[PDB]
Amino acid sequence: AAAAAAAAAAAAAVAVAVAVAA
Amino acid sequence: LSMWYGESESNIRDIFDKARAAAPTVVFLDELDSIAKARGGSLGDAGGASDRVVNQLLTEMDGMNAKKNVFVIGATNRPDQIDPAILRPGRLDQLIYVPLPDENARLSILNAQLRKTPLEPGLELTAIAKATQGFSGADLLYIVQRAAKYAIKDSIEAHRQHEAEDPVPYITKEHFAEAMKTAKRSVSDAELRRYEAYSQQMKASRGQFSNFNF
Amino acid sequence: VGYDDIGGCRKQMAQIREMVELPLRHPQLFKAIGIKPPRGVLMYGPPGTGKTLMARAVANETGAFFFLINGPEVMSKMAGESESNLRKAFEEAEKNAPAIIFIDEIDSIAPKRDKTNGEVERRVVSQLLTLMDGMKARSNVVVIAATNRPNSIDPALRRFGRFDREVDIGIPDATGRLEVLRIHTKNMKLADDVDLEALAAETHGYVGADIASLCSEAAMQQIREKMDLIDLDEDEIDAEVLDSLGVTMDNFRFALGNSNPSALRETVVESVNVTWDDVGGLDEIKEELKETVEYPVLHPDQYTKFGLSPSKGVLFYGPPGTGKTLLAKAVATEVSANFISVKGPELLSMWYGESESNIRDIFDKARAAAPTVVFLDELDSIAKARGGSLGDAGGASDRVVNQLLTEMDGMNAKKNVFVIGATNRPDQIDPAILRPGRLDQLIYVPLPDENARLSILNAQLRKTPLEPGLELTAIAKATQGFSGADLLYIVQRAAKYAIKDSIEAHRQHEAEDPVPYITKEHFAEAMKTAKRSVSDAELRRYEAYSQQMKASRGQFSNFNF
Amino acid sequence: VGYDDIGGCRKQMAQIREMVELPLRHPQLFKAIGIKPPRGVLMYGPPGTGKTLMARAVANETGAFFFLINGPEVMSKMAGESESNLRKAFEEAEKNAPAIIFIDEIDSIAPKRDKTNGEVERRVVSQLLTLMDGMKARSNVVVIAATNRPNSIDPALRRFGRFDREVDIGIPDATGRLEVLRIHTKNMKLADDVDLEALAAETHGYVGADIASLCSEAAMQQIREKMDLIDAEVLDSLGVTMDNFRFALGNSNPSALRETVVESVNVTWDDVGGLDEIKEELKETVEYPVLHPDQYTKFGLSPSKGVLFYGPPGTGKTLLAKAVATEVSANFISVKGPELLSMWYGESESNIRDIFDKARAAAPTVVFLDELDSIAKARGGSLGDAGGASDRVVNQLLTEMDGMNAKKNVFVIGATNRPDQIDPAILRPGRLDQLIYVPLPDENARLSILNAQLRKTPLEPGLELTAIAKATQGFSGADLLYIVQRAAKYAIKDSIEAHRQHEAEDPVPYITKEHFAEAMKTAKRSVSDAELRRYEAYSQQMKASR
Ligand SMILES: [Mg+2]
Ligand SMILES: [Mg+2]
Ligand SMILES: [Mg+2]
Ligand SMILES: [Mg+2]
C-alpha cells in the first residue's frame, strides 16, 4: 500500500524601512 | 507599530476589536501625537505608514461600525501635532484643558500627596502653597520627596549614633525649609504662553457667544 | 527532588498544590460545596524561575499517574499522525487513575491559528482544543503547562475549562533569594564564615537559576584554590585534602563579582576600573548621588514607613570633559545595583518602529532586573525638542522621544530604575523630559575651582611616583581656567617627557633606572604647551543657562512659616 | 591535533580543560564537595581564533565519546524531522559512555524566537531547550557550542543548565602570537637568520589562521623564488629566509581588517621635507606607547591618543598620514570625509561604531579621520535636517572616542582645512589632544622639500636648488611639486625630440638649469593672502589661549 506525507517549509515576507532626507 | 507591512494597522484593528468585544470598555491612548500626526507632512516616509495608521484609526473610531460604548481617552501635551480629523466631534469631542493649579488646588494636591505620611502636628501647608506660584503637581511631589529624603537622612544618622553608643518619628518644618530651596518650576513661560495661545485660539473659534436667549 | 526544593515562591506553590493534591486526597469538601475544582494550570515567567522544577516536584510528590509531553515531541512527518499521538497520550492518561499531564514548552505545540500559515500546526491546535474541552470533556485529569511566552498562545486555550488559572512564577525577592541560597547550599561542605544574608542582599536580579550557577562556580573556585598547590596528583587524591574543603566568603565574593544575572547576560558592560578615590573634586555631587542611589536600595523599610516613593532621575550638564562620564563609570563600578550603559544613538535602526522596540526592551529588562542604573549618555541625540524637526526624517525622532517619556512615566509597576543623563547642551533637550518624575534633579557640573583642581591633580597622580620635593599647589594656582581633561593632558605630557628621558638614558647606558619619577623640569616643560579646552562663549552659554535655572530656583532661598 | 597544537590562549584552555576532564577523571572530589559540575560551554569570539581546533583537540585527547553536530545539517523540509534528528543525536550520545556533544555554528539553528517568522526554527529552538533542560535532562553528557554572534541567540538558551559559562576565545597578545608562530613553524625547515620574536612583535591584529596564512605564504614565496631560479639535491637546499617572512608580512593584513585594507602607497619619513619638529613629535606620540608600554605602566598613566593637523591646503598633512601608514607598526584605517554617511535612518552612526569597533578590536590601530569638516561640523546647526543627522553623527563620534570604553591604544589622526568650523567638544583633550598647525614652509623648509622630492632622479653634478628654494618665498609643497613636474615634462619633451631626430637621421640623461628656468617662469602661488590671514588669525588666537 502507498502512503502520503505532509510538508510545510516557509513563505516570503515584506519589510518596511525608513529613510532620511536633506 | 511594527517593521512589517500592515502589521501596525492589524494590531490597531485587533486592539479595537477586543475593546468593542468586551464592551463597555475604556481605551487610553497615551501621547496621541506620536501615532496620530497631521498627514502629508513627512517629505520622506516609510511608504506612508504613519498616514495609513492615522487613516486606520479614523475609520475604526468612525466608520461602518456600531456604537458599542467604547470611550477613547487621549493624553498629549502637544495638541498642535494632532490631525484635525481626529479632533472632530463624534471621534474625540471633549477637549479638556488641564491648567496649572491655583492656590486652593496646590493646597489640595499637597494634602492629597501627604495623605499617607506622618506629619508634624504644627506644620501648615498654606505657606508652601502661597509660596509655590508657577509650580506643577510634579514639582510639589519633588518638594515632598526631598523633604522625605532629608527626614530619612536624619533617621539614618540618628540610628548610626544609637549603634555607636523613634529619633525622628515624623517629618518636621526643617525638612521642608531645607528641601524647598532647590525646588524649581518645570514649565517655562514660553510653553505656558503657547498653551494659553492654543486655549485662546479655541475660544476665538467660539466667536460672538454670550448669555443669549433664543 | 521534593517539596522543599522549590523555594522562593510559596504562593504559587500553594496555588498549584491546592488543585493538584486536595481534590485527590479529600474531595469531600468539593462534593459538599457542589462545585468542581480547576483542572488547568499555566506556569509562565522568565526562564530559569523554576517551572520545570515545580513540574518535577509535583511528579515526585503525587502518587497519581504522571505523563510528561515535551513540546515538539509530538510532530511527525506523516499527515495526520501528530494528532494521533496526542490522542494516544490523552487516552492513555485518562484510562488510568486520576492523572496529571504536563505539557512543557507549549509555545511550539499551540501557536495562534490566525497568524500561522502551515496546516499541520492548525490541525494539532484544533485536536488539542477538542481534547481539552469538547463533548465528553475529561474525567479527573489535570493538565499543567509551562511557557516562557503566554502572549504567543491561542486565545481559545487561555480559557476556563482548558487553562483556567495562570500562575505567574516571577523573580524572587530578597527573602526568596535567601531561601534559594539556603536550599542550594544545604548539601555541600560549607565554611563557618558564611553569612547567607549578605549574599542574598547583594544579589539583586538573580532568577534562582543563577543562584545555582553562582554556588557551583564558587565551589569550583574553592577546589581550584585547594588543588593548585596542595594536591596536584593526576593518579589519586589523599583523603586529608578532601576534608579541608570549605567554600569561603572570599570565594563567594569572587563568584559574585564575576557572575551577572542571566537576564542581562547580553548587555554586560565590560569592566572598567574607576573609583570614588579616582574621582577628584565634586564632593557634594558625589555624596548627593551616593545618597540618591543607596538609600532606596539599602533602606526600603524607611521609605515604606514614610509612605513616599524615592526620587530617581538625575541629569548632568556642563562644559565637556568635566567628569560626567567619569562619575558614570565610578557609579557603575562601586554601586551595588546593576548597570545598563548605552551611548547616544546606539539604539537607532532603519526599520520602522525598531528603535521604539529597542527602547521598550531595554527599559523592560531594566525594571525586570531591578534595582538597575541606566546611563543615558548624550541625550541630545535621542531626545530633542519634539516638533522642531521641520526637516522630516519620517518623524521617527518624535516617536523615540514619546516612547522615552511614556516608558519612564506611564502605566508601570513603579519599580526601582534610576536614570542618569549626561549632556553638554541641555538647551536642546525637550522640556517634557526635564520635569520631575523623569529627571528630578538637574545638577550643574561646573568648572573646577582652585581646591577642586588640586584634588583632581592628587587623584590623577595617586599612583604615579613623584619627586619628593614636588608640590602641585603652584600647578593648581597657575591654570585658573583649566578643566579636568586639561589637567590630565598636562600630567600625560609630563609622563611623555619622563619616558623620553628614561628611554634615551637607557639607550645611552646600553651603548656604553636613572629616572625613577617625574620631576619639576618635566612638569615645567609639559606646562609650556598647556591650553584651555573650553572658551568663554561656551562658558557664557553654560552660565547663562545655569542662571536661568537659578531664576527658576532663586524665588525661595529660605522662607518663614 | 592535541592540546599542544592549540596555543595562544591559556585561560580559556584551562577553563574548558578542567570541566571536560576532571569530572571524568576524578569524580571523588565532586562527590566529596556535594555539587555537580557545570555541563555546558558556549565558545564565542571573532572568526578564525581556534574554537573548532580546541574542540577537535579535546575530542582527540579525552577518552570519552565525541559526537559532532553541524548547524544546518539537521534541518529538513518535512514537518517534525529536524527535531527527530536532534532527538536521535542526543539519545545516541547518551546511550553510550559519558560523551561530548559539539553544536558547531549554533547561531544558525537557534535565533531569537520572537524575531523569526517561520515555524520549524521555533520548534527546533524549543527542542534544544527541552533537550538540554527538562525532566531527566542529562546524565554524564557534556554539551559544547561555537558561535560568532552571541547576541543573536535566544536569551532562554544563555542560562545556567544549558550553557553555564560563555568563554571568550578572543585575539591573542604578543606572547600568544609568539607561541602561535612557534607552533606553526615546527614542521617546516627554517633558516637560522629569521627570529620569530621580532615577527610576533611586528604582527598586532593577526589571529590564528592569519598566522597560518602568513607561514603558508612565506613558504610559497620561498618555493616560488627558488623554483624559478632552478630548472633530489634541491630538497636539501630548502630553507625559508627572513626575507620571505618579511615579504609575506608586508603583503598581508589581519582578516578582520582585510576589507578595509588601503591601496599600498610608497612614502617614507625622508620623502617628506621640512616639518622636522612635527614629524618627531608625531613619531614620539605614536611609537612610544606601542614599543615601550613597560614605562607607561610603571608611571601609571595613559598616553595621548588624538592629533589634529590644520593649515593651508596641500602643505603635507595627508602626506604625513601616508608616511605614518607606511612607517608605523600599528594597523591603519583610512576614511574619506563623508564616506561613512548614508541615506537611511541610524546607519551613519552604525558605520562609525563598526569602524571604531574593528579598530579597537585589532589594536593598536591608527584611525585617520580625513576632512573632519564634513563629519564634525558644529553641533547645533540651523534646525531641522540641517542638523538632524549631523548632530547624531557627532554625538556617536564623541561617545565612541571618549566614554564607557576600555583604553586600547586607538590613535585618531585628524586633517582639516577650516578648523574654526569644528565642534569644540571634539577638540577637547582626551579626544584630540594635539592641535598641530602645519604652516607654509620657509626658505630652508622649501629647500628640504625640494631635496626630498628630487631624491630619486638624475641631476646634473653642478646643479644647486638654493636659488629655486629662495626664489619663491610664498609657495607650498604642492607648488614645488608643480615646478618639478613642469621641469620634468620639458626635459622629457627634449628627450623625445632628440630621440625622434636621431631616428629620422641617452641624449639628455639629466634635467638642466635651462629646463628649470624655462619651467619656473609660469608659477602659481596658489594659496591666497586672505586664506593666510585667516590661518594666521586662528593660530594667534590659539597661541593667545595658550
Ligand atoms: Mg526548565
Ligand atoms: Mg562623556
Ligand atoms: Mg570553526
Ligand atoms: Mg591632502
PDB file of N, CA, C and O in Angstrom, chain B residues 1-3 31 33-34 41-42 44 77-78 123 131 135 145 152-153 155-156 166 171 173 180-181 184-186, chain C residues 291 295 299 302-303 305-306 308-311 351-352 386 392 394 402 406 411 431 434 436 552-553 556-557 559 561:
ATOM      1  N   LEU B   1       3.294  49.950  16.669  1.00  0.00           N
ATOM      2  CA  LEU B   1       3.957  49.994  15.373  1.00  0.00           C
ATOM      3  C   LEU B   1       4.868  48.786  15.184  1.00  0.00           C
ATOM      4  O   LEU B   1       5.377  48.207  16.145  1.00  0.00           O
ATOM      5  N   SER B   2       5.071  48.411  13.922  1.00  0.00           N
ATOM      6  CA  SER B   2       5.865  47.238  13.589  1.00  0.00           C
ATOM      7  C   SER B   2       6.599  47.476  12.278  1.00  0.00           C
ATOM      8  O   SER B   2       6.177  48.278  11.441  1.00  0.00           O
ATOM      9  N   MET B   3       7.709  46.756  12.111  1.00  0.00           N
ATOM     10  CA  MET B   3       8.538  46.932  10.925  1.00  0.00           C
ATOM     11  C   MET B   3       7.861  46.385   9.674  1.00  0.00           C
ATOM     12  O   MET B   3       8.115  46.881   8.572  1.00  0.00           O
ATOM     13  N   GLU B  31      -0.185  59.835  24.680  1.00  0.00           N
ATOM     14  CA  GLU B  31       0.603  60.591  23.706  1.00  0.00           C
ATOM     15  C   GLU B  31       0.101  60.344  22.281  1.00  0.00           C
ATOM     16  O   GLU B  31       0.777  59.753  21.437  1.00  0.00           O
ATOM     17  N   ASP B  33      -0.124  62.279  19.949  1.00  0.00           N
ATOM     18  CA  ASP B  33       0.642  62.951  18.911  1.00  0.00           C
ATOM     19  C   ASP B  33       1.777  62.092  18.378  1.00  0.00           C
ATOM     20  O   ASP B  33       2.440  62.502  17.422  1.00  0.00           O
ATOM     21  N   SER B  34       2.041  60.936  18.984  1.00  0.00           N
ATOM     22  CA  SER B  34       3.089  60.070  18.464  1.00  0.00           C
ATOM     23  C   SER B  34       2.617  59.282  17.248  1.00  0.00           C
ATOM     24  O   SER B  34       3.353  59.155  16.266  1.00  0.00           O
ATOM     25  N   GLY B  41       2.818  65.692   6.061  1.00  0.00           N
ATOM     26  CA  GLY B  41       3.984  66.461   6.465  1.00  0.00           C
ATOM     27  C   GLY B  41       5.295  65.790   6.104  1.00  0.00           C
ATOM     28  O   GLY B  41       6.251  66.456   5.697  1.00  0.00           O
ATOM     29  N   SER B  42       5.360  64.468   6.249  1.00  0.00           N
ATOM     30  CA  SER B  42       6.601  63.726   6.046  1.00  0.00           C
ATOM     31  C   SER B  42       7.006  63.776   4.578  1.00  0.00           C
ATOM     32  O   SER B  42       6.359  63.159   3.726  1.00  0.00           O
ATOM     33  N   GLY B  44       9.969  62.560   3.460  1.00  0.00           N
ATOM     34  CA  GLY B  44      10.468  61.212   3.278  1.00  0.00           C
ATOM     35  C   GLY B  44       9.925  60.282   4.340  1.00  0.00           C
ATOM     36  O   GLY B  44      10.162  60.491   5.533  1.00  0.00           O
ATOM     37  N   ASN B  77       0.557  66.430  25.448  1.00  0.00           N
ATOM     38  CA  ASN B  77       0.936  67.778  25.840  1.00  0.00           C
ATOM     39  C   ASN B  77       1.290  68.647  24.646  1.00  0.00           C
ATOM     40  O   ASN B  77       1.693  69.797  24.829  1.00  0.00           O
ATOM     41  N   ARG B  78       1.177  68.118  23.430  1.00  0.00           N
ATOM     42  CA  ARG B  78       1.426  68.869  22.201  1.00  0.00           C
ATOM     43  C   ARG B  78       0.214  68.721  21.296  1.00  0.00           C
ATOM     44  O   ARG B  78       0.209  67.897  20.372  1.00  0.00           O
ATOM     45  N   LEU B 123       2.652  71.706  61.607  1.00  0.00           N
ATOM     46  CA  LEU B 123       3.017  72.107  60.256  1.00  0.00           C
ATOM     47  C   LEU B 123       1.778  72.435  59.433  1.00  0.00           C
ATOM     48  O   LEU B 123       0.816  71.662  59.403  1.00  0.00           O
ATOM     49  N   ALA B 131       3.633  79.997  48.467  1.00  0.00           N
ATOM     50  CA  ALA B 131       4.985  80.299  48.022  1.00  0.00           C
ATOM     51  C   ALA B 131       5.303  79.674  46.674  1.00  0.00           C
ATOM     52  O   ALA B 131       6.076  80.249  45.899  1.00  0.00           O
ATOM     53  N   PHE B 135       4.308  76.454  40.153  1.00  0.00           N
ATOM     54  CA  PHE B 135       4.666  75.051  40.250  1.00  0.00           C
ATOM     55  C   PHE B 135       3.570  74.167  39.666  1.00  0.00           C
ATOM     56  O   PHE B 135       2.442  74.597  39.419  1.00  0.00           O
ATOM     57  N   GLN B 145       9.233  64.753  48.118  1.00  0.00           N
ATOM     58  CA  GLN B 145      10.247  63.704  48.094  1.00  0.00           C
ATOM     59  C   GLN B 145      11.560  64.180  48.702  1.00  0.00           C
ATOM     60  O   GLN B 145      12.223  63.423  49.416  1.00  0.00           O
ATOM     61  N   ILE B 152      14.781  60.927  56.084  1.00  0.00           N
ATOM     62  CA  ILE B 152      15.435  59.622  56.121  1.00  0.00           C
ATOM     63  C   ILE B 152      16.914  59.775  56.454  1.00  0.00           C
ATOM     64  O   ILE B 152      17.487  58.951  57.172  1.00  0.00           O
ATOM     65  N   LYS B 153      17.557  60.823  55.935  1.00  0.00           N
ATOM     66  CA  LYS B 153      18.961  61.062  56.258  1.00  0.00           C
ATOM     67  C   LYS B 153      19.142  61.285  57.754  1.00  0.00           C
ATOM     68  O   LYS B 153      20.056  60.724  58.378  1.00  0.00           O
ATOM     69  N   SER B 155      17.151  60.263  60.121  1.00  0.00           N
ATOM     70  CA  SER B 155      16.889  58.991  60.785  1.00  0.00           C
ATOM     71  C   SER B 155      18.106  58.079  60.721  1.00  0.00           C
ATOM     72  O   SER B 155      18.454  57.423  61.709  1.00  0.00           O
ATOM     73  N   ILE B 156      18.763  58.022  59.562  1.00  0.00           N
ATOM     74  CA  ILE B 156      19.898  57.121  59.391  1.00  0.00           C
ATOM     75  C   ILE B 156      21.054  57.553  60.279  1.00  0.00           C
ATOM     76  O   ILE B 156      21.689  56.724  60.943  1.00  0.00           O
ATOM     77  N   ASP B 166      11.309  56.459  68.242  1.00  0.00           N
ATOM     78  CA  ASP B 166      11.990  56.912  67.036  1.00  0.00           C
ATOM     79  C   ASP B 166      12.651  58.261  67.292  1.00  0.00           C
ATOM     80  O   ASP B 166      12.007  59.187  67.784  1.00  0.00           O
ATOM     81  N   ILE B 171       8.179  63.823  59.764  1.00  0.00           N
ATOM     82  CA  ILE B 171       8.816  64.954  59.104  1.00  0.00           C
ATOM     83  C   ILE B 171       8.531  66.228  59.894  1.00  0.00           C
ATOM     84  O   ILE B 171       7.480  66.373  60.530  1.00  0.00           O
ATOM     85  N   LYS B 173       9.296  70.789  60.235  1.00  0.00           N
ATOM     86  CA  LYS B 173       9.333  72.007  59.433  1.00  0.00           C
ATOM     87  C   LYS B 173      10.670  72.152  58.723  1.00  0.00           C
ATOM     88  O   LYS B 173      10.735  72.653  57.593  1.00  0.00           O
ATOM     89  N   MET B 180      12.916  72.934  50.104  1.00  0.00           N
ATOM     90  CA  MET B 180      12.310  73.809  49.109  1.00  0.00           C
ATOM     91  C   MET B 180      13.249  74.904  48.619  1.00  0.00           C
ATOM     92  O   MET B 180      12.817  75.776  47.860  1.00  0.00           O
ATOM     93  N   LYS B 181      14.519  74.881  49.020  1.00  0.00           N
ATOM     94  CA  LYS B 181      15.468  75.840  48.469  1.00  0.00           C
ATOM     95  C   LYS B 181      15.992  75.430  47.101  1.00  0.00           C
ATOM     96  O   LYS B 181      16.601  76.260  46.416  1.00  0.00           O
ATOM     97  N   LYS B 184      12.022  74.010  41.781  1.00  0.00           N
ATOM     98  CA  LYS B 184      12.030  74.813  40.568  1.00  0.00           C
ATOM     99  C   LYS B 184      10.765  74.542  39.767  1.00  0.00           C
ATOM    100  O   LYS B 184      10.104  73.516  39.941  1.00  0.00           O
ATOM    101  N   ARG B 185      10.438  75.479  38.881  1.00  0.00           N
ATOM    102  CA  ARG B 185       9.266  75.363  38.023  1.00  0.00           C
ATOM    103  C   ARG B 185       9.618  74.565  36.774  1.00  0.00           C
ATOM    104  O   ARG B 185      10.597  74.876  36.090  1.00  0.00           O
ATOM    105  N   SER B 186       8.818  73.540  36.478  1.00  0.00           N
ATOM    106  CA  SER B 186       9.141  72.662  35.358  1.00  0.00           C
ATOM    107  C   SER B 186       8.823  73.306  34.015  1.00  0.00           C
ATOM    108  O   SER B 186       9.582  73.145  33.054  1.00  0.00           O
TER     109      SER B 186
ATOM    110  N   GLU C 291      23.772  59.139  47.988  1.00  0.00           N
ATOM    111  CA  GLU C 291      22.528  59.024  48.741  1.00  0.00           C
ATOM    112  C   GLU C 291      21.382  58.632  47.820  1.00  0.00           C
ATOM    113  O   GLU C 291      20.636  57.689  48.108  1.00  0.00           O
ATOM    114  N   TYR C 295      20.105  55.022  49.255  1.00  0.00           N
ATOM    115  CA  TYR C 295      19.028  54.997  50.242  1.00  0.00           C
ATOM    116  C   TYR C 295      17.844  54.134  49.814  1.00  0.00           C
ATOM    117  O   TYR C 295      17.431  53.267  50.606  1.00  0.00           O
ATOM    118  N   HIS C 299      17.689  50.891  52.336  1.00  0.00           N
ATOM    119  CA  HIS C 299      16.688  51.143  53.371  1.00  0.00           C
ATOM    120  C   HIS C 299      15.296  51.262  52.757  1.00  0.00           C
ATOM    121  O   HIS C 299      14.699  52.346  52.749  1.00  0.00           O
ATOM    122  N   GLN C 302      12.511  52.192  55.538  1.00  0.00           N
ATOM    123  CA  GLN C 302      12.314  53.600  55.866  1.00  0.00           C
ATOM    124  C   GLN C 302      11.332  54.250  54.899  1.00  0.00           C
ATOM    125  O   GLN C 302      10.411  54.968  55.312  1.00  0.00           O
ATOM    126  N   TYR C 303      11.515  54.005  53.600  1.00  0.00           N
ATOM    127  CA  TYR C 303      10.622  54.593  52.608  1.00  0.00           C
ATOM    128  C   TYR C 303       9.203  54.069  52.770  1.00  0.00           C
ATOM    129  O   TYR C 303       8.234  54.818  52.602  1.00  0.00           O
ATOM    130  N   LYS C 305       7.827  53.032  55.564  1.00  0.00           N
ATOM    131  CA  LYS C 305       7.266  53.643  56.763  1.00  0.00           C
ATOM    132  C   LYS C 305       6.876  55.090  56.521  1.00  0.00           C
ATOM    133  O   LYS C 305       5.898  55.575  57.099  1.00  0.00           O
ATOM    134  N   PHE C 306       7.613  55.790  55.665  1.00  0.00           N
ATOM    135  CA  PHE C 306       7.288  57.173  55.362  1.00  0.00           C
ATOM    136  C   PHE C 306       6.268  57.313  54.241  1.00  0.00           C
ATOM    137  O   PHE C 306       5.802  58.428  53.987  1.00  0.00           O
ATOM    138  N   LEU C 308       6.340  57.242  50.962  1.00  0.00           N
ATOM    139  CA  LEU C 308       6.677  58.065  49.810  1.00  0.00           C
ATOM    140  C   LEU C 308       7.696  57.354  48.938  1.00  0.00           C
ATOM    141  O   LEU C 308       8.568  56.640  49.442  1.00  0.00           O
ATOM    142  N   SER C 309       7.576  57.551  47.629  1.00  0.00           N
ATOM    143  CA  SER C 309       8.458  56.913  46.661  1.00  0.00           C
ATOM    144  C   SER C 309       9.708  57.759  46.438  1.00  0.00           C
ATOM    145  O   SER C 309       9.627  58.990  46.408  1.00  0.00           O
ATOM    146  N   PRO C 310      10.863  57.119  46.284  1.00  0.00           N
ATOM    147  CA  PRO C 310      12.118  57.868  46.189  1.00  0.00           C
ATOM    148  C   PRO C 310      12.232  58.621  44.874  1.00  0.00           C
ATOM    149  O   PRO C 310      11.605  58.278  43.869  1.00  0.00           O
ATOM    150  N   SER C 311      13.054  59.666  44.892  1.00  0.00           N
ATOM    151  CA  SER C 311      13.413  60.357  43.663  1.00  0.00           C
ATOM    152  C   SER C 311      14.425  59.520  42.894  1.00  0.00           C
ATOM    153  O   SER C 311      15.333  58.926  43.481  1.00  0.00           O
ATOM    154  N   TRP C 351      14.769  50.291  10.369  1.00  0.00           N
ATOM    155  CA  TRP C 351      13.440  49.716  10.278  1.00  0.00           C
ATOM    156  C   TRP C 351      12.428  50.577  11.026  1.00  0.00           C
ATOM    157  O   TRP C 351      12.777  51.405  11.870  1.00  0.00           O
ATOM    158  N   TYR C 352      11.157  50.377  10.699  1.00  0.00           N
ATOM    159  CA  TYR C 352      10.091  51.233  11.199  1.00  0.00           C
ATOM    160  C   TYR C 352       9.632  50.699  12.550  1.00  0.00           C
ATOM    161  O   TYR C 352       9.136  49.573  12.639  1.00  0.00           O
ATOM    162  N   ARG C 386      10.551  68.063  20.509  1.00  0.00           N
ATOM    163  CA  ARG C 386       9.585  67.497  19.577  1.00  0.00           C
ATOM    164  C   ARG C 386       8.901  68.601  18.785  1.00  0.00           C
ATOM    165  O   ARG C 386       8.614  69.681  19.308  1.00  0.00           O
ATOM    166  N   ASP C 392      11.903  66.588   7.873  1.00  0.00           N
ATOM    167  CA  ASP C 392      11.369  65.330   8.376  1.00  0.00           C
ATOM    168  C   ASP C 392      12.260  64.173   7.943  1.00  0.00           C
ATOM    169  O   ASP C 392      12.506  63.982   6.747  1.00  0.00           O
ATOM    170  N   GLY C 394      11.041  61.281   8.493  1.00  0.00           N
ATOM    171  CA  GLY C 394       9.929  60.428   8.834  1.00  0.00           C
ATOM    172  C   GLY C 394       9.300  60.730  10.176  1.00  0.00           C
ATOM    173  O   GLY C 394       8.279  60.120  10.516  1.00  0.00           O
ATOM    174  N   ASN C 402       8.658  60.318  22.458  1.00  0.00           N
ATOM    175  CA  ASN C 402       7.400  59.941  23.094  1.00  0.00           C
ATOM    176  C   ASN C 402       7.533  58.613  23.825  1.00  0.00           C
ATOM    177  O   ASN C 402       7.026  58.452  24.944  1.00  0.00           O
ATOM    178  N   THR C 406       6.889  58.023  27.886  1.00  0.00           N
ATOM    179  CA  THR C 406       5.868  57.145  28.439  1.00  0.00           C
ATOM    180  C   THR C 406       6.407  55.776  28.809  1.00  0.00           C
ATOM    181  O   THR C 406       5.627  54.897  29.185  1.00  0.00           O
ATOM    182  N   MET C 411       2.017  53.727  32.474  1.00  0.00           N
ATOM    183  CA  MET C 411       1.325  52.618  33.134  1.00  0.00           C
ATOM    184  C   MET C 411       2.349  51.538  33.457  1.00  0.00           C
ATOM    185  O   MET C 411       2.580  50.617  32.674  1.00  0.00           O
ATOM    186  N   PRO C 431      11.613  70.017  26.960  1.00  0.00           N
ATOM    187  CA  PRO C 431      11.176  70.346  28.326  1.00  0.00           C
ATOM    188  C   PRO C 431      10.339  69.265  28.987  1.00  0.00           C
ATOM    189  O   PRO C 431      10.267  69.231  30.221  1.00  0.00           O
ATOM    190  N   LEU C 434      12.623  66.972  31.160  1.00  0.00           N
ATOM    191  CA  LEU C 434      13.335  67.602  32.262  1.00  0.00           C
ATOM    192  C   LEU C 434      12.452  67.822  33.483  1.00  0.00           C
ATOM    193  O   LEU C 434      12.896  68.444  34.453  1.00  0.00           O
ATOM    194  N   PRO C 436      10.231  66.843  36.908  1.00  0.00           N
ATOM    195  CA  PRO C 436      10.318  65.842  37.975  1.00  0.00           C
ATOM    196  C   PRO C 436       9.423  64.649  37.686  1.00  0.00           C
ATOM    197  O   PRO C 436       8.412  64.753  36.990  1.00  0.00           O
ATOM    198  N   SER C 552      14.629  80.083  38.023  1.00  0.00           N
ATOM    199  CA  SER C 552      13.590  79.115  38.347  1.00  0.00           C
ATOM    200  C   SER C 552      13.709  78.602  39.779  1.00  0.00           C
ATOM    201  O   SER C 552      12.744  78.036  40.302  1.00  0.00           O
ATOM    202  N   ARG C 553      14.868  78.787  40.420  1.00  0.00           N
ATOM    203  CA  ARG C 553      15.119  78.258  41.754  1.00  0.00           C
ATOM    204  C   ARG C 553      15.253  79.329  42.831  1.00  0.00           C
ATOM    205  O   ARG C 553      14.970  79.043  43.999  1.00  0.00           O
ATOM    206  N   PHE C 556      12.937  81.364  46.422  1.00  0.00           N
ATOM    207  CA  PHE C 556      12.713  80.959  47.804  1.00  0.00           C
ATOM    208  C   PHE C 556      13.911  81.231  48.703  1.00  0.00           C
ATOM    209  O   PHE C 556      13.777  81.942  49.704  1.00  0.00           O
ATOM    210  N   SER C 557      15.082  80.681  48.370  1.00  0.00           N
ATOM    211  CA  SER C 557      16.228  80.670  49.273  1.00  0.00           C
ATOM    212  C   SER C 557      15.820  80.031  50.596  1.00  0.00           C
ATOM    213  O   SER C 557      15.839  78.805  50.731  1.00  0.00           O
ATOM    214  N   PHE C 559      12.615  80.578  53.608  1.00  0.00           N
ATOM    215  CA  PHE C 559      11.369  81.263  53.917  1.00  0.00           C
ATOM    216  C   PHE C 559      10.985  81.028  55.373  1.00  0.00           C
ATOM    217  O   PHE C 559      11.581  80.210  56.078  1.00  0.00           O
ATOM    218  N   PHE C 561       7.731  80.128  57.968  1.00  0.00           N
ATOM    219  CA  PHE C 561       6.404  79.528  58.021  1.00  0.00           C
ATOM    220  C   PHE C 561       5.389  80.502  58.608  1.00  0.00           C
ATOM    221  O   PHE C 561       5.480  80.878  59.778  1.00  0.00           O
TER     222      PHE C 561
END
